[PDB]
Amino acid sequence: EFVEEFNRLKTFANFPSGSPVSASTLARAGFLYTGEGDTVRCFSCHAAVDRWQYGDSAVGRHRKVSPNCRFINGFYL
Amino acid sequence: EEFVEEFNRLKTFANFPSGSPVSASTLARAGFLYTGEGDTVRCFSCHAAVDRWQYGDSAVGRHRKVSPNCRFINGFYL
């Protein structure tokens, strides 16, 4: 369902174009856009991450908050 | 586990940045433990990791945003 990158990238309507991390990178890192600020939420682990700066790795920050996430550990590949 | 008591979460805040916009007691009261890196904290219940704290932040408000279904935040611990 949200296993498809493309469907996750559909949730990034109205995501801020100002953000230093693109919607594309985020969706590839397993995230959906919450529709509030730059807060994104993983479709698998349901954990969220916010406050993106220049140079963040979306995958890195995702591993940091949920090192045991199925997405991040390659369950869906 | 043992981190249900606020005082036990407060004990994990050794070496927390003195300059933090949000104090250790505010964070421990919001359910958080200090991971020992930067200003990164982690809820004992829902495992949400939060960092980059700024003036204006509510520790509980940010907690709820990242994990609206967190057991701790919804009073599951009496």
Ligand SMILES: O=C(Nc1cccc(C(=O)Nc2ccc(S(=O)(=O)O)c3cc(S(=O)(=O)O)cc(S(=O)(=O)O)c23)c1)Nc1cccc(C(=O)Nc2ccc(S(=O)(=O)O)c3cc(S(=O)(=O)O)cc(S(=O)(=O)O)c23)c1
């Ligand atoms: O836990 C969560 N998430 C979580 C938790 C609580 C609430 C919410 C929440 O708010 N949910 C929702 C919000 C919004 C929406 S939405 O707005 O609707 O879109 C939701 C929609 C739906 S729906 O399905 O689409 O309807 C469903 C949910 S929901 O999640 O179902 O409710 C939603 C989310 N994820 C997770 C998953 C997998 C692995 C890990 C992981 O890595 N854990 C760990 C990390 C680090 C450490 S560390 O301390 O060692 O570093 C860990 C230590 C230990 S320890 O050694 O045992 O102490 C144990 C773990 S453990 O967890 O691995 O056991 C650790 C974490």
Ligand SMILES: [Zn+2]
């Ligand atoms: Zn995840």
Ligand SMILES: [Zn+2]
């Ligand atoms: Zn929590």
